[PDB]
Amino acid sequence: MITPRTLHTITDDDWTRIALLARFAFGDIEPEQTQAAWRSMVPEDATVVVPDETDDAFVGQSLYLDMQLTVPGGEVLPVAGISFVAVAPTHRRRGVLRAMYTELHDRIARAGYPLAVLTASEGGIYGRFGYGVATIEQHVSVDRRLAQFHPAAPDPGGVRMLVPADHRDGLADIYDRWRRRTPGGLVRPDALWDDLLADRPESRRGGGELFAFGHQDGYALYRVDRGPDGRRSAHVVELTAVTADAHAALWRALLGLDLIDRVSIGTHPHDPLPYLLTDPRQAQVTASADDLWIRIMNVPAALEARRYQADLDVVLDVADGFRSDGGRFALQISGGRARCTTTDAPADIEIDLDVLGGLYLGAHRVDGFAAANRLRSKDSELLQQFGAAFAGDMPAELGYGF
Amino acid sequence: MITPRTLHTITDDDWTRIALLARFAFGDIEPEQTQAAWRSMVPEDATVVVPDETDDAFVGQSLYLDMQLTVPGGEVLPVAGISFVAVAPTHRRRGVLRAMYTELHDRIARAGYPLAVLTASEGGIYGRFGYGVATIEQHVSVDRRLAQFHPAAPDPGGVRMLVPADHRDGLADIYDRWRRRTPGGLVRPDALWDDLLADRPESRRGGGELFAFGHQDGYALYRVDRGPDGRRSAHVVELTAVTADAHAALWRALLGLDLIDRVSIGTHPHDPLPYLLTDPRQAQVTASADDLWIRIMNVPAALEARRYQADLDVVLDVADGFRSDGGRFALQISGGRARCTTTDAPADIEIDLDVLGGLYLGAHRVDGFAAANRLRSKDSELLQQFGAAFAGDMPAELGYGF
Amino acid sequence: MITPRTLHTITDDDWTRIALLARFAFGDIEPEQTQAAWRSMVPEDATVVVPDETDDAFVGQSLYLDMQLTVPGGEVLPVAGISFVAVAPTHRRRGVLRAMYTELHDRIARAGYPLAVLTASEGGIYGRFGYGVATIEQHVSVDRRLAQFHPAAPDPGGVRMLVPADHRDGLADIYDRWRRRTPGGLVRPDALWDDLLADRPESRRGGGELFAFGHQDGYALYRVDRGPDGRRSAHVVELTAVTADAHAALWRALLGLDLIDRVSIGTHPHDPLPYLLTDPRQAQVTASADDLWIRIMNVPAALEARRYQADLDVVLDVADGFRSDGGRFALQISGGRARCTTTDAPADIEIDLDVLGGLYLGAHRVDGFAAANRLRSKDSELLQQFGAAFAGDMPAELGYGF
Amino acid sequence: MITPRTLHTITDDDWTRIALLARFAFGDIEPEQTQAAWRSMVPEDATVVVPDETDDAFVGQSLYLDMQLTVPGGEVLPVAGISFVAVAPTHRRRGVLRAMYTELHDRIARAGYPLAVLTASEGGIYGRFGYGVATIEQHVSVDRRLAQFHPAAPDPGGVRMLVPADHRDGLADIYDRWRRRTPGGLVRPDALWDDLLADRPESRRGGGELFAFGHQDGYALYRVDRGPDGRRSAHVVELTAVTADAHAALWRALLGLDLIDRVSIGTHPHDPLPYLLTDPRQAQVTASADDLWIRIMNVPAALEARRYQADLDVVLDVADGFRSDGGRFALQISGGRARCTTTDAPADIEIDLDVLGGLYLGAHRVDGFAAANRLRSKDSELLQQFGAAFAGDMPAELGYGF
């Protein structure tokens, strides 16, 4: 049988067991300083585990991080960031995750979070729990030997070569300004900043010691990697720009790396980069995947918190097959502001809870989910209004991975 | 030393010259019947050529095809499909294309086409001539051994295994119905259908003989090829679905190909495929690039022909650095329909002509162009409205390559 | 409602349907003349099909070939060679195969075949139907620049360079002699020889026209190709050797091919080749897989037909989860000769029907099957004796693929 | 020169010389702690060297380890494990190995070892010295995303996730149980366990730090590595299972590693793994090579120490082209026990000494050696009897590399 236990706080011996299970279940684990940084974000009663039959090792674990997320319009919501989820390879597919998630989401609801959020190791896990893909990350690789900037593109200058660690406060404030105006922005505590700028050798998936370009309103952190042959590439770890000027200035700097063949980055689908070039094909998309996932815990609170770009007057029937967070709601939007209240009236639109989360930061169209029968309406004209309302003011992008 | 001449009709001897230049300039050329099918679509006075010093050969050529394009909301416009553009590698970068395009577009304008359209061999060529990227093709590969359908995805059945050459009329009608509903749709004449279905071994890149799945409301044409090892993959040449049911049923058939490891397709960004699966990541994007380019020749006609997703009342200053097809226009969109009138009033929004063409089928947000200074307004609220209006209710996809 | 239909005889029209379905199901199909050669081996009432709702096409098919298989000891048994098995991708995993196979095996049993045999497109299909892997094919690649023959190894001479198509009868007779002495040998009809020696381009696999080395007591057919780049490679299509002298002579000729880098072949696990070399590592196994599968239809007939390598006296309980061809059998083996009679007596050894087929040509140890609980006995030393008895005195190898 | 000498003991000064030559001759060398552990198993008078001109360095070396090998039937024999064999690249192919081997084997014989054993850097070296390939290692790679366990396969549970360095004694205990039951088993002293469990970075071969699955009756040690693509793979360093249940349970744990694509291991040809799966092809063999080589030093003692699977009464003439350890022997085997006595009687079977060693742990058939004239008889049925007798009841596997 499966009986999860909610740990009031995590003792050192608990973390040792959490690290061991995670390293086995995932196949590797981040360095100790990174683990400690994440652990420091877990609030009370936010760790759910399943002990082995002698109450020694954990065979299942899950926890959440106390976080703050920017939504469309600029409102910042407290959200529970699910993390360190793992079930021992010896105990998988027996309902351990489901048991753990049932308790964990009770804890999250009890604590008042209007949203839970996560990034997923695999794409087929969390839909069934009501999580929708809220942002998309695309891998873009730029051939900097061929790329040229469009004659109209800004060339504002003002970029400096920086030792990142010497500018912790400056970089953190640029990120904060970006965070406040970008849906998907997350508050990034000091511990995370310190770990990033520590730049530990283990931390390197693009090879080599951190470089940084700095601008008044943006920065880019990157690493250079050498091929067997001897061909250099740059991997942008993070590029955060508050203004279009900064974004362009930083890209001009990056594409100015003379002995570098290609520059790559994980970015959002509407990155201005290719529009800045004379030939947009030089900014090559090589992959695209889900990034931030969102489960709406409290539909009225979530829907009223964000802003919209079209008016709407509908009754939504939100289907929740995991918890009871769905039901029928009157959704009335005017002036880009929504009122969303429980109702008994017949629904105009039926929508799966995960779909509602997926649309929440403005990342998808309704017609794809509609084709899949996960969103439905007798009135296809209404569906379009709905999709148009949920569109975003600013392209969404997850501030950092967790 | 460059003087284009316009061919009133294309003689067999003229075409022999055109084929020769095309083959040299491109490095290869389609089969005879294929060429003949395209030639059959060229109207009067629609070919511009530049001969060599002794009028033995052409060292420059360009022509257009008489075509019909579906725009957002369903109006079908006559359009000039530019094709077989080539300048001898011995005469390149001397202004030969520029000279030819100048004359060709004069002809297009005199013939009354509101749009010119093309597909580009490279991405850095046509922006300067006012062409914007109007649709996007993404290469998607599905690991069919791992993909599973979402519990809600339609499973209507009704798919037959077809000899495609035996159902020319049925396939053509399905295509026609898709065409009428989908921006980017192009009328496809009998000659093209015949050539497609002839399935000639040279135009047979990426597999063996065609297979076809047929549904009342859709079809998929595909080929299978072998790895050196002996592993098989399927490449969908064309999948055309009038309804969501047909699209789903066809994908279920393709993903049921037992001995095939992967199924790939060149599709559009908003293909419902990933929404049909339990794990959307299994629909893997491996490339994304420009497909259809559009130059608006007649701003009022083009803007009034399409429907819009939001209402607007602005003055638009359209910059044309190639011809005189821009200027200031009052654009008033009301109930999703536009009146567009030349005016002297000051502008609210400045936009490069190519950008207007690129937005024309709903394929982009405004942010990229704006950041690049290719679309300009002192009111950023206004630009977002403008982008919202130009969105489409149906995802755009070019009917076929030309 | 799956109602299989048995074809009393195959009409040209039926075959047209069979070829269409096979091509869709497999991803392609062998040449018409090859199909015809297989078709010539199908006896009456040996084809079972399932029509589509329209009764136009088949959505399922299966058939068997009338064949003759050599078993350990030299006895030659009539066997039904299952082939052309396919279910339409639109109709799979609905029990169509099971329904067809149920009828087809009823037909096979009524025709009196003691064994049914097949080669499998995938390894997870036929176990559940009682088929065991009876031979193993290993891909072996020899670096002929480095390989050197052991000082003791035969160097008989006697090999000629042949135009194989000019030597059909001589080749055929060498194969026949090999067939009579090798378990797994299949009678190979003139139609198959003719098709092989026709060497139709379609089936070459990128390799060139056939070469053949000829010996009094053996032959090798091989092709050469040069993939990237200019480097040549030889793939042996078939090496059939009646004597050890011929085997060695043929290999010395193959490894004498001066401009060839590597010689490869699909052979059996106990091929003498590496034992002929000073460094056995130069004969590199790169792959290993099931080749021939056998389902014993008549346990007494099958077991009494073959000879055994040790004496035994046991009761077998053979489990058949598909038909009723198992039961308890008294197996008395004396002088390498078996009497197998059904009994009510309690069993010493319990074995799955597929396992019994798998052991039938001497290909496995009992250990793996026992660990997997597919073969069971309290007296573990009795299992070893069972294994010893079922060993062969000549390594088994499938005569040809089908 | 060549004038070898035997070190009575190895001084730190000598060992430094041995490590210098080894590094040069091999192109690299294990860490100091690893060397020390091997050095600790070298008994008296067990190192043969050839000094350079000045006697300040060696230009040739060879030594043996005092070891204990399990043979079929379970007797454990003292054996001499040859290691650190090296000749300076400046002194090679002048007969220095041969000269050293002559003295070393005199020492081995004088010390009383009935067998000498080694693993080979290349496959063509040691057969000439009377060493036969006694065990085979195959690299198997499992696609764990597709692999599924057969419905009959044991599912015993009981597997724990261990920090292997915290369970040295428990792991050693399990290995000792396995090695006593498995021909090829080798006593593994504490020094080797310590070195293995110290898991030094330079020994990890790209993979990360060790994982261990532990069971009451088995363990698996493995590492995980990433690719450029960020995909993970697991390589099993060692899987040691006393029972069938333990073996199945460990593989179930391994194939349960959710984020790993493939799990690989170097195992023996008769590993039960593919028999545990529904599709045996998912356990893909990708390589196969010699592992343990054996030279029989004392034919009567070696042949009498092991047990046999069948009875036999023949005279062997053993050909030894390197020493004089061959001759004619009366081999009488009854009740699986052999008496082997030197004799003048004429032989029924002639066998090269290396072949006798190759057959000694049950790994081969006679067919190959016979075809190569390395094993000879007029009575071909007597050869099969000889082969059946030398078969093993437990599949042989080398305990560890040395």
Ligand SMILES: CC(C)(COP(=O)(O)OP(=O)(O)OC[C@H]1O[C@@H](n2cnc3c(N)ncnc32)[C@H](O)[C@@H]1OP(=O)(O)O)[C@@H](O)C(=O)NCCC(=O)NCCS
């Ligand atoms: C992912 C995870 C914890 C699953 O735990 P689990 O206990 O096996 O899951 P459950 O048994 O509760 O499964 C619940 C349901 O989700 C499904 N599911 C679980 N993991 C899945 C995966 N990786 N992909 C797809 N579906 C999955 C199950 O099939 C089941 O569906 P069903 O209800 O229709 O039967 C586990 O496999 C694991 O530890 N994996 C490694 C990845 C990881 O560490 N965690 C995720 C980081 S985001």
Ligand SMILES: CC(C)(COP(=O)(O)OP(=O)(O)OC[C@H]1O[C@@H](n2cnc3c(N)ncnc32)[C@H](O)[C@@H]1OP(=O)(O)O)[C@@H](O)C(=O)NCCC(=O)NCCS
């Ligand atoms: C493409 C094409 C016909 C160009 O002809 P061309 O006569 O060299 O072009 P022009 O000299 O008139 O060039 C006009 C301008 O476009 C630019 N241009 C032309 N071809 C270009 C290309 N492939 N990429 C980028 N820019 C290009 C020139 O640099 C020039 O810029 P400028 O005005 O600032 O000087 C020619 O290169 C060709 O035939 N190549 C093969 C590709 C092809 O077959 N045609 C297009 C298939 S859609």
Ligand SMILES: CC(C)(COP(=O)(O)OP(=O)(O)OC[C@H]1O[C@@H](n2cnc3c(N)ncnc32)[C@H](O)[C@@H]1OP(=O)(O)O)[C@@H](O)C(=O)NCCC(=O)NCCS
């Ligand atoms: C193999 C094929 C004919 C199966 O037909 P099907 O009608 O889908 O099979 P069924 O529905 O009767 O399946 C029966 C059982 O076999 C199982 N099976 C396992 N692996 C399988 C596989 N690759 N294909 C089909 N069934 C498989 C089914 O899951 C089912 O198991 P269950 O009873 O436990 O649920 C079909 O997949 C096909 O046409 N593939 C091309 C390859 C081929 O034809 N075989 C070559 C002959 S070797």
Ligand SMILES: CC(C)(COP(=O)(O)OP(=O)(O)OC[C@H]1O[C@@H](n2cnc3c(N)ncnc32)[C@H](O)[C@@H]1OP(=O)(O)O)[C@@H](O)C(=O)NCCC(=O)NCCS
């Ligand atoms: C292996 C080793 C020490 C050879 O020393 P050597 O002094 O060159 O050998 P010899 O000259 O005494 O050669 C003896 C015989 O074996 C043969 N031989 C030696 N090395 C061989 C090899 N790598 N492959 C094939 N044959 C070889 C010789 O040709 C010679 O044959 P012959 O008697 O018929 O002429 C040496 O090559 C070396 O140091 N290699 C590096 C790794 C190593 O030693 N391996 C041991 C790991 S088990």
